[PDB]
């Protein structure tokens, strides 16, 4: 089930920067994945927090905007990873720009979008064990 992965992930990316907040298999290669995916594209992610500009009055709207565009023409795993890392970006500039309540808010959003927009694709395409298989190393 979906609300769990978001937590351990968000909690992982927040923890691995200095901040503390609020079977077990997929998680771990979803962390090795995010981490490799972010280093994979460090120079591309730098340009991202520089266009983020997060205020709570805009947070919902900022998140919606991106997520809908990212998955507009379809889903694949790479996109799904990119989604998790983006949640991680928001959750961090929240804590940085002193908005840690958002971190709770962003978590619910990520979860509402997994369950109400991405679940079907993951089921119709092998579940998360499918993913682990593919990421492996």
């Amino acid at each position: 089930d979906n609300r769990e992965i978001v937590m351990k992930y968000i909690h992982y990316k927040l923890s691995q920067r200095g901040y503390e907040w609020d079977s077990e298999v997929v998680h771990l290669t979803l962390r090795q994945a995010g981490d490799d995916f972010s280093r994979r594209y460090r120079r591309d992610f730098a340009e991202m927090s520089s266009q983020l500009h997060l205020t709570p009055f805009t947070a919902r709207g900022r998140f919606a905007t991106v997520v809908e565009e990212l998955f507009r023409d379809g889903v694949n795993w790479g996109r799904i990873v990119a989604f998790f890392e983006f949640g991680g970006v928001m959750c961090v500039e929240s804590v940085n720009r002193e908005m840690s309540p958002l971190v709770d808010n962003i978590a619910l959003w990520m979860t509402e979008y997994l369950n109400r927009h991405l679940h079907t694709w993951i089921q119709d395409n092998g579940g998360w064990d499918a993913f682990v298989e593919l990421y492996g190393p």
Partner: peptide
């Protein structure tokens, strides 16, 4: 929509480079 299209691109490149 910047920011999202160019996550998309790298997402899709990743999903390539892992095909």
């Amino acid at each position: 929509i910047x920011i999202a299209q160019x996550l998309r691109x790298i997402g899709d490149x990743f999903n390539x480079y892992y095909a």
